[PDB]
């Protein structure tokens, strides 16, 4: 299968036609996506199979073929880019200044950009092109707008 670094669509043929259920990042031979996209199930890349390696429902993350490799973090000050890969549409970079999710266990950056559910797993990048987290786990606020956490894993 394709092992080249980059952003990929996660598709299924189990619903009507071919449907995009999410997105993920291939880096250092490991595929990274959000748990809610695949529910930890195995994936196909051409004729090759990608088996789950690590996952956590509370973090809402999963890696395939190896351990989670993404370790860059939002600096808390600078604008970032969401590399949105929406269903049926070309990959497009959107620049924004994150907001913050404040929790009892600490603060996390958050991006206030609204895209269809099948965009979940799209990467958020810093100015060096490093992936600082994945888009698609968040909340709906007072005015009806969606705000995603910048969800990042831990490189062991």
């Amino acid at each position: 299968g394709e092992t080249t670094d980059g952003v990929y669509r996660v598709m299924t043929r189990r619903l009507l036609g071919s449907t995009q259920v999410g997105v993920g990042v291939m880096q250092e031979g490991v595929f990274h996506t959000m748990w809610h996209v695949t529910k930890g199930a195995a994936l196909r890349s051409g004729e090759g199979r990608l088996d789950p390696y690590w996952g956590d429902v509370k973090q809402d993350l999963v890696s395939y073929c190896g351990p989670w490799k993404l370790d860059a973090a939002w600096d808390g000050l600078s604008e970032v880019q969401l590399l949105a890969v929406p269903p049926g549409e070309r990959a497009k970079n959107i620049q924004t200044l994150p907001g913050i999710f404040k929790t009892k266990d600490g603060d996390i950056g958050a991006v206030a950009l609204d895209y269809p559910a099948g965009t979940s797993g799209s990467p958020i990048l810093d100015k060096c092109g490093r992936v600082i987290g994945l888009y698609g786990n968040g909340v709906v606020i007072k005015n009806g707008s969606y705000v995603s956490a910048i969800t990042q894993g831990k490189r062991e």
Partner: peptide, 11 residues
């Protein structure tokens, strides 16, 4: 489920 490449990751 299957994956399809959509692009490079660049700023």
């Amino acid at each position: 489920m299957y994956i399809e490449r959509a692009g490079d990751i660049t700023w």
